[PDB]
Amino acid sequence: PPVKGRATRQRAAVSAALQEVEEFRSAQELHDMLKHKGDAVGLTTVYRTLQSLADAGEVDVLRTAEGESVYRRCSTGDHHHHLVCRACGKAVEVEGPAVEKWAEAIAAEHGYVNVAHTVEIFGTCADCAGA
Amino acid sequence: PPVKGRATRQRAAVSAALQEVEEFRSAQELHDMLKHKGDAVGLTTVYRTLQSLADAGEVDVLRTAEGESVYRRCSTGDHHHHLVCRACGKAVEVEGPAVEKWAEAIAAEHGYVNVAHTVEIFGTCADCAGA
Ligand SMILES: [Zn+2]
Ligand SMILES: [Zn+2]
Ligand SMILES: [Zn+2]
Ligand SMILES: [Zn+2]
Ligand SMILES: [Zn+2]
Ligand SMILES: [Zn+2]
């Protein structure tokens, strides 16, 4: 995830941390993990970096049930949706043109100019049910 | 909108105020308009009664983009999704089988035991362009 400004070891470290993992996580959790592995990087610094990255779109955002935003550097850059298990945190890249066509159709029927769909599916793995 | 608690003027007043308005609105906005109407009801009371109603399923919840929560009453008791114009705040309920079929297919393919899909979509309506 290249940054608009000059690259610095803090930005490189947070980028390495983002690409290191695949689950969704907030600024606090990634701050914890980077400090524990030996980065010593600021909370507001990582917050600003992920704000800039989300503005660039290199990472994907998701508001949890409480409300806090979690972030995930997704491999696929095209339009896509994520199936997320809260017990595991794993994200599966799922995309369907049917929902996009439905959104376009309902927007046209209602005469709406632009459509910005917010779709998320929350579930549990089969292993989660098993003990 | 019956409330699980005993019959009191607070619950009746907040339920009537919610019924009168047909726009997604935050707890603070509901408290302010209730105060202006002369109810003189507490903000914590508004929050508690609103949470009780949301747990009862008689009301529809939604999370704002910035983080706050808005709530609205829809006449239909059946499951439905919402199109909400951020510029005006007006919300309209629709239902399309395609999202349900896609969710079922994804759950079957990935083996997820149970899933909970949230589909709330946003777009500007015609009067926004009109001047
Ligand atoms: Zn992705
Ligand atoms: Zn999509
Ligand atoms: Zn799981
Ligand atoms: Zn509704
Ligand atoms: Zn509008
Ligand atoms: Zn649905």
JSON list of N, CA and C and ligand atoms in Angstrom, two decimals, chain A residues 24 58-60 72-82 91-94, ligand 1:
[
{"chain": "A", "resi": 24, "resn": "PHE", "atom": "N", "xyz": [-9.66, -8.93, 9.99]},
{"chain": "A", "resi": 24, "resn": "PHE", "atom": "CA", "xyz": [-10.03, -7.55, 10.26]},
{"chain": "A", "resi": 24, "resn": "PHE", "atom": "C", "xyz": [-9.60, -7.16, 11.66]},
{"chain": "A", "resi": 58, "resn": "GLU", "atom": "N", "xyz": [-6.50, 1.43, -0.59]},
{"chain": "A", "resi": 58, "resn": "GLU", "atom": "CA", "xyz": [-5.64, 0.25, -0.61]},
{"chain": "A", "resi": 58, "resn": "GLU", "atom": "C", "xyz": [-6.11, -0.79, 0.41]},
{"chain": "A", "resi": 59, "resn": "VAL", "atom": "N", "xyz": [-6.76, -0.35, 1.48]},
{"chain": "A", "resi": 59, "resn": "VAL", "atom": "CA", "xyz": [-7.31, -1.25, 2.49]},
{"chain": "A", "resi": 59, "resn": "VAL", "atom": "C", "xyz": [-8.83, -1.10, 2.49]},
{"chain": "A", "resi": 60, "resn": "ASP", "atom": "N", "xyz": [-9.50, -2.10, 3.06]},
{"chain": "A", "resi": 60, "resn": "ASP", "atom": "CA", "xyz": [-10.95, -2.15, 3.14]},
{"chain": "A", "resi": 60, "resn": "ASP", "atom": "C", "xyz": [-11.38, -1.98, 4.59]},
{"chain": "A", "resi": 72, "resn": "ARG", "atom": "N", "xyz": [-8.71, -4.17, 6.83]},
{"chain": "A", "resi": 72, "resn": "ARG", "atom": "CA", "xyz": [-8.13, -5.42, 6.29]},
{"chain": "A", "resi": 72, "resn": "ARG", "atom": "C", "xyz": [-7.53, -5.17, 4.91]},
{"chain": "A", "resi": 73, "resn": "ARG", "atom": "N", "xyz": [-6.22, -5.37, 4.73]},
{"chain": "A", "resi": 73, "resn": "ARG", "atom": "CA", "xyz": [-5.56, -5.24, 3.44]},
{"chain": "A", "resi": 73, "resn": "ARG", "atom": "C", "xyz": [-5.96, -6.44, 2.59]},
{"chain": "A", "resi": 74, "resn": "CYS", "atom": "N", "xyz": [-6.97, -6.26, 1.75]},
{"chain": "A", "resi": 74, "resn": "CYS", "atom": "CA", "xyz": [-7.50, -7.34, 0.93]},
{"chain": "A", "resi": 74, "resn": "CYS", "atom": "C", "xyz": [-6.67, -7.52, -0.33]},
{"chain": "A", "resi": 75, "resn": "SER", "atom": "N", "xyz": [-6.45, -8.78, -0.71]},
{"chain": "A", "resi": 75, "resn": "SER", "atom": "CA", "xyz": [-5.63, -9.07, -1.88]},
{"chain": "A", "resi": 75, "resn": "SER", "atom": "C", "xyz": [-6.27, -8.55, -3.16]},
{"chain": "A", "resi": 76, "resn": "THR", "atom": "N", "xyz": [-7.58, -8.74, -3.31]},
{"chain": "A", "resi": 76, "resn": "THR", "atom": "CA", "xyz": [-8.27, -8.35, -4.53]},
{"chain": "A", "resi": 76, "resn": "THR", "atom": "C", "xyz": [-8.61, -6.86, -4.49]},
{"chain": "A", "resi": 77, "resn": "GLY", "atom": "N", "xyz": [-8.20, -6.14, -5.53]},
{"chain": "A", "resi": 77, "resn": "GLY", "atom": "CA", "xyz": [-8.45, -4.71, -5.63]},
{"chain": "A", "resi": 77, "resn": "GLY", "atom": "C", "xyz": [-9.73, -4.33, -6.33]},
{"chain": "A", "resi": 78, "resn": "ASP", "atom": "N", "xyz": [-10.35, -5.25, -7.06]},
{"chain": "A", "resi": 78, "resn": "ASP", "atom": "CA", "xyz": [-11.59, -4.95, -7.75]},
{"chain": "A", "resi": 78, "resn": "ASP", "atom": "C", "xyz": [-12.74, -4.86, -6.75]},
{"chain": "A", "resi": 79, "resn": "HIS", "atom": "N", "xyz": [-13.93, -4.53, -7.25]},
{"chain": "A", "resi": 79, "resn": "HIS", "atom": "CA", "xyz": [-15.11, -4.49, -6.40]},
{"chain": "A", "resi": 79, "resn": "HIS", "atom": "C", "xyz": [-15.42, -5.88, -5.87]},
{"chain": "A", "resi": 80, "resn": "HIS", "atom": "N", "xyz": [-15.73, -5.96, -4.58]},
{"chain": "A", "resi": 80, "resn": "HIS", "atom": "CA", "xyz": [-15.94, -7.24, -3.92]},
{"chain": "A", "resi": 80, "resn": "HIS", "atom": "C", "xyz": [-16.61, -7.00, -2.58]},
{"chain": "A", "resi": 81, "resn": "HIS", "atom": "N", "xyz": [-17.10, -8.08, -1.98]},
{"chain": "A", "resi": 81, "resn": "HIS", "atom": "CA", "xyz": [-17.67, -8.08, -0.64]},
{"chain": "A", "resi": 81, "resn": "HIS", "atom": "C", "xyz": [-16.96, -9.13, 0.19]},
{"chain": "A", "resi": 82, "resn": "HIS", "atom": "N", "xyz": [-17.15, -9.05, 1.51]},
{"chain": "A", "resi": 82, "resn": "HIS", "atom": "CA", "xyz": [-16.45, -9.92, 2.45]},
{"chain": "A", "resi": 82, "resn": "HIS", "atom": "C", "xyz": [-17.46, -10.64, 3.34]},
{"chain": "A", "resi": 91, "resn": "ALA", "atom": "N", "xyz": [-11.91, -13.42, 6.78]},
{"chain": "A", "resi": 91, "resn": "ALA", "atom": "CA", "xyz": [-12.69, -12.77, 5.74]},
{"chain": "A", "resi": 91, "resn": "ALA", "atom": "C", "xyz": [-12.54, -13.56, 4.45]},
{"chain": "A", "resi": 92, "resn": "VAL", "atom": "N", "xyz": [-13.67, -13.85, 3.80]},
{"chain": "A", "resi": 92, "resn": "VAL", "atom": "CA", "xyz": [-13.71, -14.58, 2.54]},
{"chain": "A", "resi": 92, "resn": "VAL", "atom": "C", "xyz": [-14.22, -13.62, 1.47]},
{"chain": "A", "resi": 93, "resn": "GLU", "atom": "N", "xyz": [-13.48, -13.51, 0.37]},
{"chain": "A", "resi": 93, "resn": "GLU", "atom": "CA", "xyz": [-13.82, -12.59, -0.70]},
{"chain": "A", "resi": 93, "resn": "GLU", "atom": "C", "xyz": [-14.93, -13.21, -1.55]},
{"chain": "A", "resi": 94, "resn": "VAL", "atom": "N", "xyz": [-16.13, -12.65, -1.47]},
{"chain": "A", "resi": 94, "resn": "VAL", "atom": "CA", "xyz": [-17.29, -13.10, -2.23]},
{"chain": "A", "resi": 94, "resn": "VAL", "atom": "C", "xyz": [-17.82, -11.92, -3.02]},
{"chain": "C", "resi": 1, "resn": "ZN", "atom": "ZN", "xyz": [-10.94, -7.86, -0.11]}
]
